[PDB]
């Protein structure tokens, strides 16, 4: 309002002075050299001068008028070239990713937050929207405090019907309400694995979970943790409940565990990592170690319920039947989480 008021006031006032001076000519010239310009013609002249366009369709003809135009050229050009960029910069910065998510009946959604970056989002969407899964109608909603760059906006345009992005902070309960956390099936928190300080990253992701649980105690949270001692702090939150699917994927625990299990059987860390990556069967015709490796890589681990014709049977018999005739590598485990139970229990 200061810039607009000074710009408009200066322009209209200076147009009035040149109006008066051109319509009443040079006194020495006995006022004979006047020019019949209207006020609006003087307003147009000063805009064409300030902008430096200078058409010369109309211009000041009197000496007093030319005199004034020299001082107006020295002051008014600097005024226009300074003010017009800044008035345009103070306008039209409309936040593109304000607004909120609207849920639709019969279709669930998840909220994804934390380390939202082009490589993290494109890796996440490749595993999440894979065609080896079943009819995944789940809509994905990203919440991140930084505006996406052109590459990441283009990645969202390629997923137009299954991904939505909203700008905001996980630490603000208004933004959690905008993203409809009270009806989300789960919230997923991605970590920066390559941060300069794992304790500051884990402490930041701890903040996120206490904020999400504070807004809604009952939402399922899935989170990456870097350091194992920070995972112990996580389960001291009163509404964190790992018995109903609150999952802390600790990278130090699972990494050093993979390595540890490879000390009993080499390459076990390779196949475990391949069982959770979603991948199709790539076909290669040349007899190579790769053709037999790629066949193995096509597998993933899946959960399913079993009861019809398998209730009360022995665990080995059950494995034999579905391995031999259903052609799928049977239950590695399971009642509870019992790996390869044997003939009893």
């Amino acid at each position: 309002v200061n810039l607009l008021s000074i710009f408009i006031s200066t322009w209209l006032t200076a147009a009035g002075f040149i109006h008066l001076v051109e319509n009443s000519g040079d006194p020495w010239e006995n006022f004979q050299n006047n020019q019949a310009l209207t006020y609006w013609e003087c307003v147009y002249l000063l805009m064409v001068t300030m902008s430096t366009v200078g058409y010369g369709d109309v211009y000041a003809k009197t000496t007093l008028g030319r005199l004034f135009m020299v001082f107006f050229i020295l002051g008014g050009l600097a005024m226009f070239a300074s003010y017009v960029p800044e008035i345009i910069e103070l306008i039209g910065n409309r936040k593109k990713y304000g607004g909120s998510y609207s849920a639709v009946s019969g279709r669930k959604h998840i909220v994804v937050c934390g380390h939202i970056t082009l490589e993290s989002v494109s890796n996440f969407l490749k595993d999440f929207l894979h065609k080896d899964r079943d009819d995944v109608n789940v809509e994905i909603v990203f919440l991140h405090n930084i505006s996406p760059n052109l590459e990441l906006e283009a990645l969202f345009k390629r997923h137009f019907t299954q991904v939505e992005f909203y700008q905001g902070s996980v630490l603000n309960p208004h933004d959690l309400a905008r993203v409809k956390i009270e009806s989300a099936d789960a919230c997923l928190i991605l970590a920066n694995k390559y941060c300069a300080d794992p304790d500051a990253e884990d402490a930041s992701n701890i903040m996120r979970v206490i904020s999400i649980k504070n807004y809604h105690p009952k939402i399922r949270i899935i989170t990456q943790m870097l350091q194992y001692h920070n995972k112990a702090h996580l389960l001291n939150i009163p509404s964190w409940n790992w018995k109903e699917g609150d999952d802390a994927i600790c990278l130090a625990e699972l990494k050093l565990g993979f390595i540890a299990q490879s000390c009993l059987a080499q390459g076990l860390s390779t196949m475990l990592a391949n069982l959770f990556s979603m991948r199709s069967f790539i076909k290669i015709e040349e007899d190579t170690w790769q053709k037999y490796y790629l066949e193995g890589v096509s597998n993933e681990m899946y959960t399913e319920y079993l009861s019809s014709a398998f209730v009360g049977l022995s665990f080995p018999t059950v494995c034999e039947l579905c391995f031999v005739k259903l052609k799928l590598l049977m239950i590695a485990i399971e009642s509870r989480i019992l790996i390869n139970p044997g003939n009893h229990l």
Partner: protein, 200 residues
Amino acid sequence: TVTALKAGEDKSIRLGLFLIISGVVSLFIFGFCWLSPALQDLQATEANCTVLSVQQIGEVFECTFTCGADCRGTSQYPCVQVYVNNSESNSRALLHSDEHQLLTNPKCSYIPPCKRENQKNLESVMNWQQYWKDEIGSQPFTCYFNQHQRPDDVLLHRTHDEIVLLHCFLWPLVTFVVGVLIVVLTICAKSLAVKAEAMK
């Protein structure tokens, strides 16, 4: 709360306010544009008027014909001048028919529809003159005069039609009214939707 519809409804308020502002601003713009024309026409008096002399000045002016698509065709025509009585001055003043004629050549009372042939603009001015030449002492015209600025010029027609004037001030007002209805219906939708949401 916040709601999903807020973005479209707040944009509808920005549009309704822009139409209110544009209605008022265009009303002032047309106000200043029509100020001098509307005063210069509506200050002219309406009078009963009678022809009192007619003559050619024995000298010719040039008009320009157009063929359609880029012609000049500068061609001579007879300058006929006509003097007429009026109720304000009661004295000799030159008839010019339409305002345009006066503005383009005030020494003659008429300009013919300019043509490629001198003979056709000659006989056109003769065919026009033989009317006003006989109207000496006839039943009055109704005609227009301007004592404040044109004491020796007289017009048969107005300088503009009131229809184009009316349209220039109608559509600013309609623009303002449409803007007000958009603001009112949007605020009504926002403030009623929260009552329906609480009552559900």
